Structure formats: C-alpha cells, structure tokens
C-alpha cells in the first residue's frame, strides 16, 4: 500500500491563477518562512547551563571502569578472566597467582582505555560483579599514558565511586 | 598441456614486449614526477629506482605472473600521473627513515635472534 507525494495538479481558474501570480510577485511563502523563524525567536531555548546543569542519565549508563569490593573490604575479583575473554577490543590484560593466604586474586589487571569501546560486555560476563562501568564520564587527560589504567587506578575508582555504583546496581539488578 | 587460460600474452615474448612498454612509460614519466611533486631527488635517482623495481622481478618466468606485474605497474603509474599519490607515497620507495639492517652473520648475532 502506497501513496504519491508529488502528483497534484493546480487548478486553472482565474482565482487560482491570480493567487499564484500574487504569490510570485509578493513572496508570500518566503514571508511564511520568516514568520516561522520569528516564532522560534520568542520560544525558550533548550540550552542547559553546563557545567552547573547536567544532562540526564540512567542507572544503566556505561562510563569509567571500576573494580569493586565486598562489604568486608575484600576484592570481588577472582581472576576468572571472563572479561578478558569477552572483550571485543582486547582492552583487558590479566595476570594472577595464589595470594599469601592462598586466595585466587589478580596480580595485574589493566584496561587500555584507548582500546576500550565502552560496550559493557565485561560487566555482563563478570559472575561476581567485580568489574563495572561507573557513572563517571568526565575523565579527560592531558597525556595518552594517563589513560592506561592499572589495577591500582581501577581499585581507586571503585573506592571513590562505590556509593553511586552500589545505588545504580541496586536500581538495575532486577533487569539483569 | 596443463590447460591454463592466458591473461594477456600467449608466451614470454609478448610479456617482455609489454614490460618494455611499461618501462618506457615510467622512464618518460620520471622527470614530470620530480617536477610536479617537488622532490629533492634528481631524475637519475628516480630512473634508477624504476630500474631497481623492474629488476626486483627479473627472475619471473610465468607469462601470467608477468602480465599481472605489468598490470600492477600500470596501476602505479596511473596513480602517479594523476597526482592521486602524494609526496609521501612516492618517497616510500626510498626508505629514507629506516636504518640500514646488516647482512653478515656476526652483526645479526650481536643484535638479536633473527636469522
């Protein structure tokens, strides 16, 4: 089922001919366009006062990565390396060994933030909610090297954003 | 018989003829390339490089492979004449930035594990 967009014939009576001639000589549709712009002039603009006002986000927002802890302070990560296997950009590098107490923990956990595509597959693949994409998005640097995150940087990110991260996970975890 | 379909030439003689026409075209083009791209090399350097690129494949005995090499060389010439290439593309033939890698056994042994 279809319709035509440009298949209408103008009427040839004297009234229509005079209307079209007056349109040509007096520029009525151009005045209509001017009126549309003038109408927009007196509308309230849609601009927000950044950085004092921020754009709306969601609990599902994928921002800066972070490594989480259990309420006791123990690391959630167990070096299963699922995030490394699933990473479409190979942005994660992991090395592990038994800890001094025999625990299964990482010794290297690096994310190349200039390789990352910020897809969130790593936090889907994680079985213990150890690695997350946080809500932060304002972390521009001045050198390339500052965007090569090691385990200390990610643990600091987790310790710094845990209050917001836990609330977002509490809001979202029943959809996952 | 081996029942192979030709590309352009029946045997090696017409392939050599096509090679000679391509060499003539490149040899004629070299001064125009030097002038247009504003290169610091001389016409002698460019013509020697054309000769070197032609002699890189001097061992080929298959007329079809020679035909494909002539096709690729004609593509490169058409790229050069129309200024589709830039100065960097032309200068990549000279490897002016890569350090000279030694050939003798002792230097390779000193530097690393490559044969």
């Amino acid at each position: 089922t279809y319709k035509f967009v440009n298949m209408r014939e103008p009427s040839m009576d004297m009234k229509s001919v005079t209307d079209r001639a007056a349109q040509t000589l007096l520029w009525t549709e151009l005045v209509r366009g001017l009126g549309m712009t003038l109408s927009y002039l007196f509308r309230e603009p849609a601009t927000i006062n950044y950085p004092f006002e921020k754009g709306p986000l969601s609990p599902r927002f994928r921002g800066e990565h972070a490594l989480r802890r259990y309420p006791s302070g123990e690391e959630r990560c167990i070096a299963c390396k699922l995030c490394e296997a699933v990473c479409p950009a190979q942005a994660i590098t992991i090395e592990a060994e038994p800890r001094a107490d025999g625990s299964r923990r990482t010794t290297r956990y690096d994310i190349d933030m200039t390789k990352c595509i910020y897809c969130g597959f790593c936090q889907e693949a994680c079985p213990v909610d150890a690695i997350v994409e946080g809500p932060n998005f304002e972390f521009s640097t001045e050198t390339h090297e500052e965007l090569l995150y090691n385990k200390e940087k990610l643990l600091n990110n987790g310790d710094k954003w845990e209050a917001e991260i836990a609330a977002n996970i509490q809001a979202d975890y029943l959809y996952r | 018989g081996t029942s192979v379909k030709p590309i352009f030439s029946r045997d090696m003689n017409e392939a050599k003829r096509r090679v000679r026409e391509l060499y003539r075209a490149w040899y004629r083009e070299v001064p125009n390339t030097v002038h247009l791209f504003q290169l610091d090399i001389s016409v002698k350097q460019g013509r020697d490089k054309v000769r070197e690129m032609f002699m890189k494949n001097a061992h080929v005995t298959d007329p079809r492979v020679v035909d494909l090499l002539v096709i690729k060389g004609k593509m490169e010439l058409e790229e050069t004449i129309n200024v589709w290439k830039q100065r960097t593309h032309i200068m990549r033939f000279f490897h002016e930035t890569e350090a000279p890698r030694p050939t003798d056994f002792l230097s390779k042994f000193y530097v690393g594990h490559d044969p």
Binding site: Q90 | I7, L68, H89, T97, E98
Partner: protein, 208 residues
C-alpha cells in the same frame, strides 16, 4: 519444536527447487550444481566460463527477471586448488525472489567483468581485485578502491596478517609521513576457542 525454533516454509522450498531445476535444464553447458538451503535460499554453482551468459539469462529472461545485483563478493579458501569463490546475489522484483550464483577461480585466472550485465558490479569488482587480487577481464577502469595508495598485497586473503606488514607515523627529520615495518607494543593475543567435542552430528564428515 514450538516457541524457540524457527519455523519452516515448504511452499517456498518447493518453488525454489523447481526454479533451480528450471535453470539447470535451460543451461546445462555451465551449471554444475543447484542447492536449496534449509532456510529457503537458492544457490547455483556454475563453471567460470558461464559468468556472462548465466547472469544475462537471469537478468533478461521473462521467467527470471533478476534485475537487481544486490551484492558481489569473493570468499578465500586456501585449501582449494581454485582459491577464490566468486559469489553473486541477485534480486528479482517482478517475482519477489532472490538467487545466488557461485563460481571459482585462482590467483592467475581472470574472470569476465559483469559491467555489461549490471553496472553496479563495477565498484564491486574493483573491491574484489583490491581485497583478494582477482583480476576481471574487460573492466572499464580496474584499480584499488579501499586500500591506501601503493599498498602491497591483498588484505582479505586468509594468509595476509591481521595487522599487515607496515605502519605509518610522522617523521620530523624528513618532515612527512613515513611507513616502517610494524611493531606492536602489545601483540594481539590469539585465542583457541574451538571445543574438542563435536557440536552438530548432521554435518559429520567421513573419517577418510
């Protein structure tokens, strides 16, 4: 079966089988095989010499009218004597149908250009020549389309490395962009993912 399984369509399967038999009967000189897949797709495997006739027949015949060339591409299988598989996808608006035509070639055997049958083939053929190195005879203007100027090799060949052989950087001594042999600070990590247990018994091969 039920909810999680894709349903079948026997009517379309029978129609495609009948039309494949039709095409095979009309052109015995070039047609080597006809197939209809389980998801109702018709493939016709032809000899390389019949590229121009068969396509012409599929375009101009009253009962075919495959007037649209949706896609033309190549597939590289190194284990085959004829390395490259040339695939044409055709759409017929009159009969609301799609067909696939497949032929083969190697590194040194040219294929006939189809620009006389479909103009759209032009760039497609160029891309094949750019990406796999297959030469198309009587192409009006054959040259690289996707790769950089002066690029050596054909990157879509299976034996071409993923990162290539050269990389680019700006050199200040010569004041220009130069190309050098590739070095990677972190090497791409190869993964061995295939399970040692068979997944689909229906596709099991004879033990030779």
């Amino acid at each position: 079966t039920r909810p999680t399984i894709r349903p079948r369509n026997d009517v379309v399967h029978k129609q495609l089988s009948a039309f494949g038999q039709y095409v095979a009967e009309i052109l015995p000189k070039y047609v080597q095989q006809v197939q209809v897949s389980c998801f109702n797709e018709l493939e016709i495997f032809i000899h390389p010499d019949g590229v121009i006739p068969v396509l012409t027949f599929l375009r101009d015949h009253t009962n075919a009218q495959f007037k649209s060339l949706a896609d033309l591409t190549a597939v590289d299988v190194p284990t085959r004597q004829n390395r490259f598989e040339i695939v044409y996808n055709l759409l017929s608006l009159r009969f609301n149908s799609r067909i696939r035509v497949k032929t083969y070639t190697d590194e040194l055997t040219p294929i006939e250009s189809s620009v006389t049958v479909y103009k759209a083939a032009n760039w497609y053929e160029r891309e094949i020549w750019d990406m796999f190195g297959v030469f198309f005879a009587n192409h009006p203007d054959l040259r690289r389309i996707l790769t950089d100027y002066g690029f050596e090799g054909h990157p879509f060949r299976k034996d071409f490395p993923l990162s290539g052989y050269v990389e680019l950087r700006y050199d200040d001594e010569v004041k220009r962009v130069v190309a050098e042999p590739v070095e990677l600070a972190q090497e791409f990590r190869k993964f061995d993912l295939n399970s040692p247990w068979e997944a689909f018994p229906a596709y099991r091969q004879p033990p030779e």
